[PDB]
PDB file of C-alpha atoms in Angstrom:
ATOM      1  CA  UNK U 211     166.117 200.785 -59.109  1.00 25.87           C
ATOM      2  CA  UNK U 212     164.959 201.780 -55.282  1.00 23.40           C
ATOM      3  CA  UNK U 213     161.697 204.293 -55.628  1.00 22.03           C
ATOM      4  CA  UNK U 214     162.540 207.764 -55.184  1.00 20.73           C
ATOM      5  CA  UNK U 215     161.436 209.605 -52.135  1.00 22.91           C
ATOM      6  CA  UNK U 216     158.527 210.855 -51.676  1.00 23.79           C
ATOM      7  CA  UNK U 217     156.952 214.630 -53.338  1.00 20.96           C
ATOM      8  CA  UNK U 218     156.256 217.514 -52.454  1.00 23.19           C
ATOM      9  CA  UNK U 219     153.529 218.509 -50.422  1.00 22.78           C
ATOM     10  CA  UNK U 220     150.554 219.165 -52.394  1.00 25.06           C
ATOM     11  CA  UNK U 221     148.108 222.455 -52.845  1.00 22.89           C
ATOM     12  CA  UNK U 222     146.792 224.466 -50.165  1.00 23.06           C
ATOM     13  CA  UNK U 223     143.681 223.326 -49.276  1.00 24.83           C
ATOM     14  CA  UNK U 224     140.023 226.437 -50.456  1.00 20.86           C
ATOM     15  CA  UNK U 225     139.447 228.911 -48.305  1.00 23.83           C
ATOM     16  CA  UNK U 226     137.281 228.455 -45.767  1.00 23.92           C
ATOM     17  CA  UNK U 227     133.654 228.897 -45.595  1.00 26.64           C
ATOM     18  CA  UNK U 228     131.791 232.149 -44.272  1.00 23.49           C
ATOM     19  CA  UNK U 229     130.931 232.376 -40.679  1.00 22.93           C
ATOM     20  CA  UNK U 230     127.579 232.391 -39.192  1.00 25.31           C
ATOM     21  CA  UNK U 231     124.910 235.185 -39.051  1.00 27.34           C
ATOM     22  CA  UNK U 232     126.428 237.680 -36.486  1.00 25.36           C
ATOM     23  CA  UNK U 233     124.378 238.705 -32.887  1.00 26.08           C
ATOM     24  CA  UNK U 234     121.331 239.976 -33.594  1.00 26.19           C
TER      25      UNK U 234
ATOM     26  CA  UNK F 550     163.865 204.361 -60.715  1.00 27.02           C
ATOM     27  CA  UNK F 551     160.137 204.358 -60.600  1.00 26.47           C
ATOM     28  CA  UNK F 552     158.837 208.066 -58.844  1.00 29.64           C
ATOM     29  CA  UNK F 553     158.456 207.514 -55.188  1.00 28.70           C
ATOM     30  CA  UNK F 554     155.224 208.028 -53.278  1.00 27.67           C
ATOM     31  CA  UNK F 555     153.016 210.789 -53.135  1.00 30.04           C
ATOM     32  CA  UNK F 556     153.788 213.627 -51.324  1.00 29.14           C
ATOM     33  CA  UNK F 557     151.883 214.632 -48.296  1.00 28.70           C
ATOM     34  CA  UNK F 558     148.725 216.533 -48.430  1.00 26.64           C
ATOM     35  CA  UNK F 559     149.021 220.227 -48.311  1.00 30.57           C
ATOM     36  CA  UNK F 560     148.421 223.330 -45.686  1.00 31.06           C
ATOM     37  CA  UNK F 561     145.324 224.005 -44.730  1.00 32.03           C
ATOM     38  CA  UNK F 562     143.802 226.691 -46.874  1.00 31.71           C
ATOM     39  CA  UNK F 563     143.311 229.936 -44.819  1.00 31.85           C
ATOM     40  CA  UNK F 564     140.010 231.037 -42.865  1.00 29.48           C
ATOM     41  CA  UNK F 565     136.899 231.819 -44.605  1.00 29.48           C
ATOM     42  CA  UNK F 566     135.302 235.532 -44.523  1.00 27.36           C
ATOM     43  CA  UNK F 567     132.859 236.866 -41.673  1.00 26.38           C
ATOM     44  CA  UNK F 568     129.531 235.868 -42.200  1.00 25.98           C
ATOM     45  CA  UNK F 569     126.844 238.613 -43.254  1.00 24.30           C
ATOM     46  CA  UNK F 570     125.130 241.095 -40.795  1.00 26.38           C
ATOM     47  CA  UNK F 571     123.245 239.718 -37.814  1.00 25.01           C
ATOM     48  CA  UNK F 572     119.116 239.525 -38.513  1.00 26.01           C
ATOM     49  CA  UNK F 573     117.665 242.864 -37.267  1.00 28.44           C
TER      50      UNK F 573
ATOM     51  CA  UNK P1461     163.864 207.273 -59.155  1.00 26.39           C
ATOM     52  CA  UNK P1462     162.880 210.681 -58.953  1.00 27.02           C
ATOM     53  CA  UNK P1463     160.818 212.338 -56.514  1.00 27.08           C
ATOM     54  CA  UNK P1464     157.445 211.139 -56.181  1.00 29.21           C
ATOM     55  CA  UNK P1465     154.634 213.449 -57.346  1.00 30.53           C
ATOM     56  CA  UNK P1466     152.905 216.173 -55.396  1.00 29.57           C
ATOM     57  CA  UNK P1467     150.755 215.470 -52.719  1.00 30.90           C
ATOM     58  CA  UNK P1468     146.688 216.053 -52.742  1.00 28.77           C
ATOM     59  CA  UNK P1469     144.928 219.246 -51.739  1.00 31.18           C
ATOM     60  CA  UNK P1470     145.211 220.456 -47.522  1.00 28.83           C
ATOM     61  CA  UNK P1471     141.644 220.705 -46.112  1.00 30.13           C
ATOM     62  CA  UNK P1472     139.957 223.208 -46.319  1.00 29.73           C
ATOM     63  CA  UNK P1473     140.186 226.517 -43.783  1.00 31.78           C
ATOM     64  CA  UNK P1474     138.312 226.783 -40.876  1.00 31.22           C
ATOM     65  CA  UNK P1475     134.834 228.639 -41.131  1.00 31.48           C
ATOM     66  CA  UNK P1476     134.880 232.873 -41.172  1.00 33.15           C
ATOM     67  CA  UNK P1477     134.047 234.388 -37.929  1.00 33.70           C
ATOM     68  CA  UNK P1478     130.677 235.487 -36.880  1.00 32.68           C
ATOM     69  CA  UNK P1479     129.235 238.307 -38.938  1.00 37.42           C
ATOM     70  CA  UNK P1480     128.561 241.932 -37.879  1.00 36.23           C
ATOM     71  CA  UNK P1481     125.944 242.827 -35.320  1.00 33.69           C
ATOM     72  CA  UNK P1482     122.500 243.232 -37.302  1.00 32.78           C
ATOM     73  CA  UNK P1483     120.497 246.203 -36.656  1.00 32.22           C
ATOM     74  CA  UNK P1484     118.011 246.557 -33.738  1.00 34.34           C
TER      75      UNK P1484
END
C-alpha cells in the first residue's frame, strides 16, 4: 500500500573540532 | 506498505574542546 | 508501510573556543 511516513531523525552529528591556538 | 522515506538528518553534534595554550 | 528508516548523521559541532593564553 501508500509508503509509510517518514523516520526518525538520524544520529547526532561528532563533536566538534578543537579551537584555535589561544592569545599569545 | 513499503517503509517510507528517510528520516531527517540529525542534531548537530555539540562544540568541540578549547584549543591548546597560546604560543609563548 | 512502516516508518521509514532513520535519518543520516547531523553535522558536525561547531569548532572549540580559542585556547588558553600562552605564557609570556
Amino acid at each position: 500500500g501508500p509508503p509509510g511516513p517518514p523516520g526518525p531523525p538520524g544520529p547526532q552529528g561528532f563533536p566538534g573540532p578543537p579551537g584555535p591556538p589561544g592569545p599569545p
